Amino acid sequence: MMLYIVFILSVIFVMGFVGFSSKPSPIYGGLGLIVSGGVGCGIVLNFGGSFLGLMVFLIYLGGMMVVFGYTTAMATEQYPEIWLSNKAVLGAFVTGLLMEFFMVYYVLKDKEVEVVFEFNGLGDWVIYDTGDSGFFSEEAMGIAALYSYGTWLVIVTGWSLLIGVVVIMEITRGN
Amino acid sequence: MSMVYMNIMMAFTVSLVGLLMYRSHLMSSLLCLEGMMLSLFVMAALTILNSHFTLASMMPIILLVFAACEAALGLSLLVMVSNTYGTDYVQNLNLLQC
Amino acid sequence: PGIVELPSLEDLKVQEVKVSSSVLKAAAHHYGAQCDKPNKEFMLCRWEEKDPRRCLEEGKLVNQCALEFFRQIKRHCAEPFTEYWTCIDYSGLQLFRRCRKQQAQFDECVLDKLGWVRPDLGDLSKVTKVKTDRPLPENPYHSRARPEPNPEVEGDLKPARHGSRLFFWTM
Amino acid sequence: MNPIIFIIILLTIMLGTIIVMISSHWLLVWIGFEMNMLAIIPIMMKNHNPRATEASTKYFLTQSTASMLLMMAVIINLMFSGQWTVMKLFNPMASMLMTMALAMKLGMAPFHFWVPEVTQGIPLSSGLILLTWQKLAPMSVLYQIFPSINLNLILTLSVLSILIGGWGGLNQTQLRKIMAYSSIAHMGWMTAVLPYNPTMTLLNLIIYIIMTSTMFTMFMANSTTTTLSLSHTWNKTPIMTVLILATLLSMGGLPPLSGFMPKWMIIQEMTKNNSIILPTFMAITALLNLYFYMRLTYSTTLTMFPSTNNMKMKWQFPLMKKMTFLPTMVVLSTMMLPLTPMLSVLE
Amino acid sequence: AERVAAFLKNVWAKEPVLVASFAIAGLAVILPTLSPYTKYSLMINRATPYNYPVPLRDDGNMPDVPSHPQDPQGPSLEWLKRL
Amino acid sequence: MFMINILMLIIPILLAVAFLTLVERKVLGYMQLRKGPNVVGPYGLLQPIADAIKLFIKEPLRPATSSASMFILAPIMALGLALTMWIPLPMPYPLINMNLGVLFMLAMSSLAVYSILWSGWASNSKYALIGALRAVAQTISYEVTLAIILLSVLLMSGSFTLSTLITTQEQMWLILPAWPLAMMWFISTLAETNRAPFDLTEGESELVSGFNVEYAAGPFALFFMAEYANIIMMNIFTAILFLGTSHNPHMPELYTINFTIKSLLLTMSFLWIRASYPRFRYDQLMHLLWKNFLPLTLALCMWHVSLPILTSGIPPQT
Amino acid sequence: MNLMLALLTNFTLATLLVIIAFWLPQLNVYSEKTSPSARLPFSMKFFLVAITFLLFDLEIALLLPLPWASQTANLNTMLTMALFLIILLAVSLAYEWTQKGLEWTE
Amino acid sequence: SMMKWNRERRRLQIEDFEARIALMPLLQAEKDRRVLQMLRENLEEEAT
């Protein structure tokens, strides 16, 4: 069962998404996204993306989601309605888990399902690469190349972040 | 395609449906927007990592950075809405009806 | 599509070098100097052919050269060598710099009893040239014939006949 | 805003669009849209009122959703082709997603609801940017991926846009809402011809921008945002009423004015491809737009609506708004039909 | 000048943290262009062999390509040993 | 075997935290011309045990929480993350040898701010929530310098591997080439862990600081243990980062003894500082970060990117 | 496997300590007591410190690969773009500083 | 001091990387035989 770690994680990934997509109180919506993000990083790690995975934790969870929860406390929620105590929220949550359960049922049984795209249920391990013996991390080499190959990317990305600071100060001044 | 893609694509679809079906809180809809980006980040990373597209390894970072900056802008607008009305309810944003 | 051709199990059979990585690491510098020729022929084959099935004979010669290399050490320098790779093996990173004393004893032994000189810093990373009789592969990618390009447009540019010819316009 | 910061923000709006237009890589196209959206929000918020905040929020939600769908299409395209080149997409699902994403960005029907509301909620100068410059980047992308676009989808979006734009404008008294529905209707012409001749998409876009720019500039010159406030112009600046009349007739597509040219050239291209029913339907439906342009000309130029006593005080002061390029734009908006063959410079 | 020196005195008295910050940043941007050892950083990075050095097929006329790693021809790392 | 290793890390961590509470009271006592605990056990050695038993059999506080799930999640998160921060530390060998161990520690600490936010949300008090938000703003502000300072030091180390910091300092402590970064790092760790003079959660300027105010909270002991585990861990990280201990592969225990002494001394300096200074105002500690540390940290980051290149001292990648 | 076991063990113990911290007091059986969204109002300044942290934190994401970036052959390009990023990070601070984005006075 | 030590570490790295290069031909030859044997074995079970 450990040989299907990626698939099991992706099932939890979808369940968390059905969590905040049914849109309970924003406080618990942030919790569903935080769990999904942590599971999402786990999936990326198991494909050899150690740096990319840790960026999710550092920047997406430790950065963006902290600010979401910060803003939710100040501007949105201070106490929440009990999760799944609302008709639409619970009905949406039940509907999502039924769709996920059936997708998982048919993919495991028939080893293949077809919705828009054709999906194979042999196991995500079968597509992996069989040749690895370099003395470095390919992922790290590709990211490090941002400063040599990606001059233009750095300029526009750097400009956008600076403009973000300016714009948000403009927006929030109020006059 | 491999089995994992089915679930990542489901997650994007779920968060997209969650984005298009509002309730009341504008905040709850912004979370669905960030959920969409998270699923894109994961699907992009899986495709790039598995194929050994080395120079594309930086693309998920740029995606995350630009989407977080756009999320900061969204949160700022939500705060300005909450200042005007005292809540982030989307039903108060109906002046332009006329 | 065709049937993928694979060699028989008997065709793949060779006497392996059943020593640990610390043993290989300890001998690596002398092994690189002594067995350069068959090793470089094998690597030229692998990069030119891009097919492991096309280099199995050269791959066997890599093993035989390695086995004869270690038989020379077992014959004249076993005890100094055994001491050297046992130190290398202790380190979790198998660091050279922790075992310079035992390395010197092994290097001194092989120089006296075999004439082997340890290659200098930078030598084993040189691009070298190898003599080979294997002909250069002609179509290593097995490419089909390329599609023919579209006919070139040539000649002198002349003004359009009667102008744009757009509805009623005379120019 | 500090004027220097206002200049930097406008230059960033332009930079985002320029990045989309020179990029050969899908990631850089997406970045250009992100940069563009970030820089335009402040100019929408700049007058600080609840209506401007609602419009900014509605615009942000629409554009962010579109940009996520665009990225989804790019990633699907990567999975099925292993490359990032801005060109025809290699998966029909990716094509549909990107086409819908770009339709949402353009405000095409049935993704149109935000255009009337967002335009109404922001100043005239911001609306001018929104309805002219903001069309350039999505059009430049559609111009490059059109070979892979589903024909039925793009023509359906075009027909709906022409119908909704025409009908939506009939019920409007607000100038900014009229220009928003006019933009939606004119959008449908540009995309309708795209499968057949993308050069005529560019022609219609350029002429639409010139005429729309002329209209907004004249509305800004007198600070008019409603039909009845525009009906006072005859008793302040009579020349402006004549210029407004000529431009509105041009936007109506009446010969011999410039606005007829794009309709004329699009009809020609569609008929060359044995498309007879669709151009005839489009031409007839465009009469809806002519109707609510003509209604404006009635209240502005061809009759004289009642004035107010305090209008006499305005007679004593000159127009001091810049009205940049207005004399040139109004001439191009009306008197260019004799130079129609010059459209080949767009080829 | 002396106006310039007075200004440097006022900031050094009121904003020593910022004076130090701009001084350190200025050195960061200037010294690399002036240093003679910057060239060695590029050379060392290029002397690090991450990939196997694929041998060349000996056509018969590459005098400057060594046939064996210990032959004299080819790039040397003598400068690095001394550095 | 690995399960033994985990418990031989977790249990001693909890015992060190317990007896750090005694060391703090006695060190603060003697700097204040008194003794501190010396009645409950010889030299107060049983005082941590008496406090622990007393706290766990105390009645739970009132009022009731606003969110039961968040009320329970916050202490689990605080303590779970606190223990997790220890697993990559090389002492000299790590429990988990990560290639990106430094980044792992950054990532895990950035998640510690959630327990503050969740406990404020679950406090059912408007004023208690505002206090939590001020604490979060302080924490994230000083996370900026910790990340940038850490990045600057790694430009001399060459990788994100924690055990590579040991090799980097084989000849010399990194505090010599990087004492300006060490100074700001050490203060940032104080402010990050809400330690005096940055302990505004325990200060006099909060809306909830009033003694007669009440809000849902607790258990006190679990939050306290999590905080003090982070104090020790940060000071262990500080020693590894700037005061690297020499490692002899044949005598690893010598590394551990010398490494433990340095960590203890750094931890004692936290107690030293708490005894010596008044408390910052909230706006003043924000000013310290945004208008002092951050400008200087950015400048020193520029310097440490340039310095290895211009001196031809770029470290190895592996 | 080991990392998963460590994380599971750490958060399992934290969970047990939490529940027994909540159950053990019930052994005493203490007497019953019988005696006891919207803006906060939130200051814009506290929102703006969080946003500034985020935007600065995103720029730090771009700087994290610097230790690896220094191993490249194109050092001049790498150093130019590294200093470019840090300088724009400084320019963001300078803009915030000179428009009183870092003040706490109302 | 940091400069001298990092220069020496770069020299040590080159030594470690060159030991790998010396061994890569042997490792490559083994890997090819191992891969081809596994494929041949899979084929035999496929025929059955």
Ligand SMILES: CCCCCCCCCCCCCCCCCC(=O)OC[C@H](COP(=O)(O)OCCN)OC(=O)CCCCCCCCCCCCCCCCC
């Ligand atoms: C070149 C080939 C292509 C050909 C296409 C056609 C080209 C023509 C379009 C050009 C663009 C429109 C500009 C036309 C210039 C208009 C000049 C004008 O009408 O005078 C303005 C007049 C002045 O009013 P006042 O300010 O009081 O000044 C008094 C003067 N002592 O203002 C007034 O007195 C108010 C007038 C009352 C309203 C009258 C409404 C009818 C106006 C008829 C002219 C409009 C023509 C546009 C339609 C096209 C016609 C074919």
Ligand SMILES: CCCCCCCCCCCCO[C@@H]1O[C@H](CO)[C@@H](O[C@H]2O[C@H](CO)[C@@H](O)[C@H](O)[C@H]2O)[C@H](O)[C@H]1O
């Ligand atoms: C196996 C181990 C089990 C865990 C055992 C935990 C034992 C905890 C013993 C704590 C000993 C007392 O330690 C002391 O406690 C008080 C809290 O009342 C702290 O007091 C501090 O926090 C409180 C608020 O929380 C403030 O009101 C006070 O002004 C401040 O000084 C002291 O900073 C600390 O030095």
